[model samples]
Target chain A: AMKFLTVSDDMNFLRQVNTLVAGKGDMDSVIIGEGDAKGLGSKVLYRAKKGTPFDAVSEGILKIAGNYDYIAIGSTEVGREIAGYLSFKTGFYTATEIFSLEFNGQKAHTKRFFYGGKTVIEEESDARILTVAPGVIEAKDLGTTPEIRDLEIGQSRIKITKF
Target chain B: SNAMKFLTVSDDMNFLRQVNTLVAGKGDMDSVIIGEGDAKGLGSKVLYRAKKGTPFDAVSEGILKIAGNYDYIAIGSTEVGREIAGYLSFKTGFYTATEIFSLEFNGQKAHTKRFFYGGKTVIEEESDARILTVAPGVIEAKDLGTTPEIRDLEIGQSRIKITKF
Candidate 1:
C-alpha cells in the first residue's frame, strides 16, 4: 500500500500542515507526522529520563521505521539532516522541500521546492521520504488531535526513563 | 587557465547566455555580473551584490548588460532566483526548471534532472530556451581557497529600508 511519513517536535504545528500529504494515505503514524484513530489529533509529546539525551527522538524514529514507506520531516536544518540520513540508510526518496503530492495505487507524485524556495520542482516515486520547507505549506487552521503514545518498540542503546 | 579575461559575470544564466560559466572558467574566479564589483573571495571580486538591497537591481545592471552574447542561462536556486526565473520565462517565453540536479547545455534547448526526496525519485526534462537553476547546498560547500578577494560592488538603483527582514 502507498504510505506517507513525517517527523516533528512541534507536534501542535505538525498536524496542521502535514495533513497536506499524510491524510492522503491510509497508513498510521504517531511517530507523528499525525492522525486520529478517532480524530483527537493532539501533538505527540515526549520526555527523556535522566540518563536519556534528547536526540533519542530521531533515534526513536529510525528505530521504528520498518513499518511505513514514506517519511516527511519539517525541513528544518536538523530535520533536513535526519531526512538525509534516513533516506540514505533506508533507501527512501527525498527532496530538500516539497509542496504538493499525488498518490496512485501503485506510486506517488509530488511537487517540491529547492534552494530555499527558489524553484518549484515536480517529481514522482514509489516509496519516499522528504522535508516540508517552512511557510511553503501554510496551515492557518488546526484540526487534529495527535495522541501521544509511549513508543514501545525496543531498547535503545542510548537509554532514557519516561514519566 | 584559458587566456581569457575574468571580467566576471552575474548569477543570471539568461543574461550570461551560456557564456557566464565560460567566463568564470576562463577568467578569474574573482569577478561579478556586469563589469565586476568589489566583493571578492577565493581571489574572486564582487560586481553583483546589490546596494539596493534587492537582487533585481543588482541583476539588472550587471547581468542585463550581457544578453544575446550566449544562448541559455543558469541562476542560483534561491528565493531571489525563483522570482527572476519565473519572470524571465514569462518575459522571454523561455522554458526553465527550478530544482536541477544535473544539466547539459549545448543549444537553443537544454536538458535537466533533479534527484531528491532521499534519492527515491528523479525528474528529467528537455526544453528550448533553457534558463535553469542549480540547487544550492546539495553538496555541502567547502572552502576552495584562501586570501580570496572581496570588493565593494557598485549599486545603481538599490538603496532603502524597503522591506523588513
Candidate 2:
C-alpha cells in the first residue's frame, strides 16, 4: 500500500481531492492540511522575507518521509512553491503545473507545461514529489461517506508579515 | 494615503483644448502634460498629458517619460498601452510580460483530449505569463477619478514634425 500526502491552501480543495481519490486502492492514506484554515477565494499574498505557510506544510511532509510513497501538492502558486521547496530539501525530482495523471500498464505518466506557453510535455517519473494543477481532472461527487482523519502538526514556522 | 492621476495623449492640439475645457468644467486637475505635434499635416501625432501644462516640443517617442510624474498612466488604446509599457521597460532595464489568452495544459499521452487537429500537431511545451490582455466586454471598466482641470502647455518648435501618409 502506498500512502499519499496532499496539502492545499483551502480545505474545500482538499475535500475535492479526497473525492477524486476515494476508490483508488493504490492510495493508502491521504493527508490533508489547511495552510491557514482559509477558503479558496482568500488570497494569501506571500513576501520573500515573510516566507509562506505552504512551505511549512511541505517541511512537515518531508519530516515524515517514509510514511508516504508520494506527496502531491494541489494547484496554485503557493502549492507549486511548496513542491519546489520540498524537492530541493529532500533531493527528489519534483514536477509542477501538472494537468493530468495516468497509470498505464507499464508505468505512471504525468502531463505538465513547459517552455513559454508554447507546448505541453508528457513524461514519466519514479520520484515522490508531484504537483497537480486544478481543473485538470474532472472530479465527481463520491456519495459513499469515507472516514476523514486529521493529523496534528505543530505550529507553522513561516509567517506572512508583508504582502 | 494613495493619490490618483488620469491623463490622455493626442496628436491634435484642438482636441487637447477640447479635453481641457471638458475636464475643467468639473474640477481642477493636479496637472496636464500635452505632447506638441507638427501642425503642417493632417492626423498629426499630438501627445496629450492630462492635468499638466503642454510641453513645447512634440514628443515622437518615450510616452513613459510622462509616467514618471504620475503614479498611474491611463491610455485610451492598445497602441498607447503597448508603446508606454515597452518604452518604460526599455528605459528601466526591466522585462515586461505581454498579455495573452488560453494557456495550454498538458494531459496524459493516452488521453483523448491530448490529440491535436487531425492528430497532426504535437504539443511539446507550455507556459504562462504574468501580464493579462483584457478585452473591453470581458471585464467591466470603472471610472473612479474626480473631474480633472485642464491646462494648455506651450509646444516647443523642435518637438513638432510634419509626416504624410
Candidate 3:
C-alpha cells in the first residue's frame, strides 16, 4: 500500500496535509513532529530529539526516507528553507509553493501560481519532496490515536553565536 | 582580474534593484527585461517583449537559450522569478539557492546567508552557486544611473496552451 509522510511543527499545517492525503484516496499518512499528531489524524508519529529545528526535522526525515514514497512540508518561509535542505540531501524532485497536486501512480500533476500570481501553471513531475502552499487545501479531521516513536537527532555544523 | 558574469531578468525595480546590489562590483551584469519597459541603471540588457498571447513557457525557453553565457543568475523571490529559477535549474543543472539575502564572492565560490525556523536561526552555506533567488522586502534599490546598450530577445512560440489569464 502506498503511504504519505508529512513533516512539520504546526497542527494547522498538518491539517492541510491530512486534506491532501484524503484527496489522494485516503492513503495512510504519518507525521514527523512533536505536536498533536492524533488531532491531525495521522496514524503514526515520529518525534525527533531536539536540536536546531532544521537539523532535527531533516535528520528525522532522512532516517525514514525509504519508508514512504511521498513526503510533504508546509510552504511557509521556514518550510521552504527546510524543503531546500531536504532536496539537496535526498536528491528528491522538489516543488515549492504548490497550490494543488494529484498523483497517477508515481508521477505527480501539480498547479501553482506564475507571473506574480497573474496566472496559474500546470506541471507534471515525479515530485517526492513538496512544499505545499498554505490556505489552499481545506483542513479536515480524522481524529485517531497515533502510535509514537522517537527519532535520533543528527549533529549540526551550524553554531549559534548569539540568541 | 577574475570577475564573474551575472544575469537577471525582470522589469520590477525592486527585484532589479537587489540584483543590482548583489552584482554591484562583481564583474559584468545583464538584465533580460520582459517587456518594453524602463531598464536604466541595470547594466547591459536584452529586452524581450513577449507577444500579447505568449505564455510563460515560451519566455522561459528564450531565456534558456542565453543562460549559459553567464556564471551566475539572480532572480527575485517572486512568482515569475521563482518559476524561472526552477526552469533554468532543471534544464541547466544549476545549483539554485532560494530566498537568499546575502552573497559574498570568494574566487569562484559564493557564500550565501538565509534565515531558517522563522528568522530564529541563520544559515550560512557555500556553493559554486549558479542561480540565486533574492528574498523580497529585505533590500532596497538604489539609483546608480547608467545608460547601457539594449538588445531584443526572440521569444519563440508558446509550448503549452494557456487557456486563460
Candidate 4:
C-alpha cells in the first residue's frame, strides 16, 4: 500500500483532497495553523507564528515530506505556489488544477483544464505531487480520527525586504 | 553590467507591452508566437505554425529549445502562460512566480509585489525569477515599431492529445 500526505490550511481544500485520496491508500494530513480537520485521516497539527511567511509552510512540509509517496494540495494561488516550490525542491513530477485523478498502482493519471477551461488534457505521472481545483468534487469527510501529532514550522527561504 | 535578456509569449499586444516596460532599453527582446500569426514590428520573432491546434505540450517542447538565451521570460497570467511557466520551470530549474502585480529591477534581482492569503495581504520579495506570470492591466501596451527578424521553428511532438475543444 502507498502512503499519502495532504497539506492545507483550508478544510474545504482538505475535503477536496479527501475526495482525491479516497480508495487510493493510507492517508494522513497536516493542517497548518488550526482547523476542524477531524475524519481527515490521522491529523497532524503545525502551528505557525503570527505573520509567518509562506516559505515557512512549504519548508515545514519539506522537512517531513519524505515519508509519503504522493502529496495533494489545493489549486488556489497559495497552494499552487507551494506546489511549485515543492516540485522544484523535491524533484517530484507535478500536475496542477487537476479535476479528475485515478491511481493505478504507482502511476497517477489525471485530467486537467487549460485554455480558460475550454480544453482538457490528460496527464500521467509516477511519484508526483498534485493540486486539485476547488468546487469540482463535493466536500466529504473521510476516515476516522486515529491520533493527533504536532509538527514545528521550518525556516523561510526568502529574505523579507518589505511587507 | 551586462544587459538583461528577455523572451516572452506574444499572445497579445498587452503582454508584449509588459515585457517592453521591463526590458525596453535594458536588454534585447524576442517573442515566440505559438500559433498562426506574424509578430512584425515587435522584437525578433520565433514563430511556430502548428497544423493542429496549439497543444501546450508541443508548445512547451518548442520553447524549451531556445529558453536558455534569456535572463527573464515573461508571460501573462493566462491559461497558456501558466502552462509554459510551469513546464519551463520544471525542465530548466528556473524560479517561477505568478500573479505579479508590481515589479522592478534592482541590480541583478527582480523585486515583486503580490497578494497573499486570498488578497487579504500584500507582500514584496526580492526574487530570482527566471520565469514569471504578470497580472493583467499592470502595464499599458504601446507599439515598438521595428522591422525585426522572424525565426520559424518546427512544431515538436507532444504526449498530450487534445480530443476536443
Which is the leading candidate under lDDT? Answer: 4
Q: Scoring model 1 with DockQ, what do you get?
A: 0.03
* Alpha-carbon runs more than 4 Å astray in model 2: A15-52, A104-107, A113-118, A144-149, A154-159, B1-165
Cα-based TM-score, every candidate: 0.42, 0.39, 0.82, 0.88
Tell me how far candidate 2 lies from the true structure as C-alpha RMSD in angstroms: 19.4
DockQ of 4: 0.48
By lDDT, the better pick of 2 and 4 is 4
RMSD of each: 14.5, 19.4, 3.4, 2.8
DockQ of each: 0.03, 0.01, 0.29, 0.48
lDDT of 2 by residue, B43-103 (tens): 1123334322222122314344444554322222132233333333334333222221122
Cα lDDT tens digits, model 3, B56-138, are 56777878888888888887776667767766766676667777778887766888887665667666767655888887776
* Chain A TM-score of each candidate structure, as shown: 0.66, 0.65, 0.83, 0.85
Report lDDT (Cα) of residue B45, candidate 3: 40
lDDT of 4 by residue, A9-57 (tens): 6767876787677677777776655566667654453444434566777
**lDDT, model 2:** 0.39
Best by DockQ: 4
- How far residue B79's Cα lies from its native spot in candidate 4, in Å, is 1.2
Fnat of candidate 3 is 0.15
> How well is each residue in A20-73 modelled by candidate 1, as lDDT tens digits?
664565434433333333342324422223222223455666676776676666
Provide a comma-separated list of chain B TM-scores, one per candidate.
0.55, 0.34, 0.86, 0.82
Pick by DockQ: 3 or 4, better one: 4
